[PDB]
Amino acid sequence: QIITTDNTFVSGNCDVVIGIVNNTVYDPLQPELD
Amino acid sequence: QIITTDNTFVSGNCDVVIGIVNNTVYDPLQPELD
Ligand SMILES: *[C@@H]1O[C@H](CO)[C@@H](O)[C@H](O)[C@H]1NC(C)=O
Ligand SMILES: *[C@@H]1O[C@H](CO)[C@@H](O)[C@H](O)[C@H]1NC(C)=O
Q1: CA B14 to ligand 2 centroid distance, Å
Q2: Preceding residues of all breaks in chain B (C to N beyond 2.5 angstroms)?
Q3: N or C: which end of chain B has fewer CB within 10 A?
Q4: Beta strand ranges found along chain A (DSSP E)
Q5: How far are the Cα atoms of B15, B24, B29 from residue A8, in angstroms, in the given order?
């Protein structure tokens, strides 16, 4: 599935997590823009 | 964590619940104003 904010939650910054990577998390409210 | 709509679900009115208090729930779409 596409990485979305529906099945992902945010918790703190990425500096404390070992072995993290970078990729875009698609917010579905952005293509709507209603 | 701050009380947000993502981690709470609503079921009926608050007249039936015993010992319930009043507090604000943060709507995350309201500061977005999309
Ligand atoms: C992710 O991006 C930040 C900021 O551009 C960078 O400092 C970090 O090294 C990146 N992560 C990786 C694994 O390259
Ligand atoms: C909570 O709100 C209800 C309805 O406005 C009110 O009757 C009640 O006294 C309030 N309780 C507190 C602790 O403010």
Answers
A1: 10
A2: none
A3: N
A4: none
A5: 34, 24, 17
Amino acid letter, residue A9: F
User: Of A9, A4, A8, which is closest to residue A26 (Cα–Cα)?
Assistant: A4
Distance (angstroms) between ligand 1 centre and the Cα of A15 equals: 10
Q: How far is CA A34 from the centre of its chain?
A: 21
| A2: three-class secondary structure by DSSP | coil
Which of B22, B23, B25 to probe ligand 2 with, by most ligand atoms within 8 A of CB?
B22
Cα(B14)–Cα(A23) distance, rounded to whole angstroms? 42
